Amino acid sequence: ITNLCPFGEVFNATRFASVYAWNRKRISNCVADYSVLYNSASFSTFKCYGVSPTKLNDLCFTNVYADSFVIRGDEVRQIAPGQTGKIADYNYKLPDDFTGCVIAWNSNNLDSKVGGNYNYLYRLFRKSNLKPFERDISTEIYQAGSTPCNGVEGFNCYFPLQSYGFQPTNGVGYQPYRVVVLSFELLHAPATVCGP
Amino acid sequence: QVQLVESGGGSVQAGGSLTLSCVASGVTLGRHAIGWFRQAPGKERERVSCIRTFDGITSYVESTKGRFTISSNNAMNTVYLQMNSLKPEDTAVYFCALGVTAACSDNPYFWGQGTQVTVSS
Ligand SMILES: *[C@@H]1O[C@H](CO)[C@@H](O)[C@H](O)[C@H]1NC(C)=O
């Protein structure tokens, strides 16, 4: 009884999360061919940290977490250790000691359309930066000015989430990208996710 | 602070077309309602069109439906009013107006200086 890791369910999901509400799937007790993903022409970003992508088929991990969401092309650079900006600061934060791979591809053909796609949101305002792998789905009115908001959206009192409103004719930096982050867990425990 | 930078408008012949642009600064489009009002000679300032930049949903008044289409490009912080099938009675000062909520039905808070549109018969 050897299970194939369900990476298809992650990369080929019909629906992707907004980055503020990023999805996590835990992958365990299974075999994966990472070489097939790494050697795929489908991905414009495949960047690994703490491990060599060429060795992945020879390693075992205690778990793999697959996080996925949509951001703009010009924000994919923020999905890396040690980065700053609205996405790394307020939406999805990798730790300095990250062991894992960041995978991205252009999704303009699925995630934009004539009239705009307003479904994908991001957090624009927050009182402090996210901790690594923190998810914030709260919607407290953000006080930007001197007047207390008392929970009321208005002048200098901001709802903290905004829509990308992806427009299909915008250039590549504005276009939606689907991102999958694979975190390779290294607990001092039996390692249940292996290569072939 | 918030500024609405308006451009476009001027003189056009009846049945012609114009495009007004409104660029917001000091705010990022993607949450708030933003739209167009106009004031024609002898008439009170009135609603023309509005778009919710949170969800792209547009709203119109009886006189503007079909001929005018409001659109946003949130990444460009720009909204557009494409004015087609223009008539002399469309002659007015057109104002970009930005809300402090997501709802088009709410009252505008920030106003542009306005742009003259003159339609000749
Ligand atoms: C996703 O689907 C494509 C096309 O059906 C397929 O070639 C690929 O193997 C799938 N990707 C993964 C990681 O399963």
Residue numbers in the entry:
A (entry chain EEE): 332 to 527
B (entry chain FFF): 1 to 121
Passage from the reporting paper:
The RBD of SARS-CoV-2 is the immuno-dominant region of the virus spike protein and the target for neutralising antibodies generated either by vaccination or infection. We report four nanobodies (C5, H3, C1, F2) engineered as homotrimers with pmolar affinity for the receptor binding domain (RBD) of the SARS-CoV-2 spike protein. Crystal structures show C5 and H3 overlap the ACE2 epitope, whilst C1 and F2 bind to a different epitope.
To further define the epitopes recognised by the nanobodies, crystal structures of the C5-RBD (Victoria), H3-C1-RBD (Victoria) and F2-RBD (Victoria) co-complexes were determined to high resolution (1.5, 1.9 and 2.3 Å, respectively), however, the C1-RBD binary complex failed to give high quality crystals. The C5 epitope has only a small overlap with the H3 epitope or with the H11-H4 epitope that we previously reported. The interface between C5 and RBD is extensive and involves all three CDR loops and the fixed sequence loop (FR2) at A75 of the nanobody. The key binding interaction between C5 and H3 nanobodies and RBD is a combined salt bridge π-cation interaction involving an arginine from the nanobody (R31 in C5, R52 in H3) with E484 and F490 of RBD. In C5, R31 is located in CDR1 and as result the side chain of R31 enters the salt bridge π-cation interaction from the opposite side to R52 but preserves the interaction. In addition to R31, residues T28 to G30 from CDR1 of C5 are also in contact with residues Y453, L455, Q493 and S494 of RBD. The aromatic ring of Y449 of the RBD makes extensive hydrophobic contacts with the main chain residues, T53 to G56 from CDR2 of C5. From C5 FR2 the main chain of S72, the side chains of N73 and N74 make hydrogen bonds with the side chains of Q498, N501 and the main chain of S494 respectively. The bidentate hydrogen bonding arrangement of N73 (from C5) with N501 explains why this interaction is sensitive to the N501Y mutation (Alpha variant). Finally, CDR3 residues V100, Y109 and F110 in C5 make van der Waals contacts with E484 to F486 of RBD.
